[PDB]
Write a protein that binds this ligand. Structure first.
Ligand SMILES: O=C1Cc2cc(Nc3cc(Cl)ncc3Cl)ccc2N1
Ligand SMILES: O=C1Cc2cc(Nc3cc(Cl)ncc3Cl)ccc2N1
Ligand SMILES: [Cl-]
Ligand SMILES: [Cl-]
Lengths: 4, 122, 122, 4
């Protein structure tokens, strides 16, 4: 999971 | 402020390809000369300008069989159908002309672009 | 010896979400309490262990309406349906419990994992 | 396009  | 799962789109496409290999929820047959290819209309539309046009048509959206132009090569179509479901293109010296012609007909602009680049290099 | 187009899976998912927003080729309604959600069975199956089980069932595969368990919160479902079609999860302090419970019911293991991690941190 |  990432910060888009 | 959403978070994003990097592998989600690839995992969705992988599962749609698994459904295709097992003939699950396929709703159309694409006829290319004597050859038949089962697929999901939504995947075809998402990948191809031609299938997008066909399946948004109020009459054609309900057809279970679609016949392609007799000039379309079944192998070129098969390579492109595999690319739609995997992101992988089996581009070879012996098939590049048939793949580019089929991608132009199907309106798959990124495939047409790589075929033109590969032909130019040789 | 294939070549690969990096953005293909993301572009396919983006187009499937565009079809969903325009209600094109949607073939099922998911009922959550009073709320109704239109979707594509194949996308639901590709994202959820629960929908995969439902639509591979010889009788349920043909249903146009699926009613979820009355304990399922419509907002939690909506957030998860958006994630299925975009890879983006709108996870907030006020919805995390409803999102985790809905993801556990829908069998969306990667969402369950991030919810457990975010709860543990707080 | 890349070599996968
Ligand atoms: O090279 C290409 C690939 C492609 C895909 C689609 N399919 C869609 C486009 C839009 Cl805007 N919304 C939904 C869909 Cl399914 C249309 C044209 C082209 N050209
Ligand atoms: O967390 C999850 C997500 C998920 C998706 C699917 N869907 C498939 C799985 C296979 Cl192997 N082939 C095809 C499909 Cl559509 C099943 C279980 C789970 N669990
Ligand atoms: Cl393309
Ligand atoms: Cl997940």
């Amino acid at each position: 999971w990432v910060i888009p | 402020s959403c978070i994003q799962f990097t592998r989600h789109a690839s995992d969705v496409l992988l599962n749609l390809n698994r459904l295709r290999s097992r003939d699950i929820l396929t709703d159309v047959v694409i006829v290319v000369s004597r050859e038949q290819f089962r697929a999901h209309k939504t995947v075809l539309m998402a990948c191809s300008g031609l299938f997008y046009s066909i399946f948004t048509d109020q009459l054609k959206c309900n057809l279970s069989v679609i016949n392609l132009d007799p000039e379309i090569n079944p192998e070129g179509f098969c390579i492109l159908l595999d690319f739609m479901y995997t992101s992988r293109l089996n581009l070879r010296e012996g098939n590049i002309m048939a793949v580019m012609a089929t991608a132009m007909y199907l309106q798959m602009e990124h495939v047409v672009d790589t075929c033109r680049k590969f032909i130019k290099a040789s």
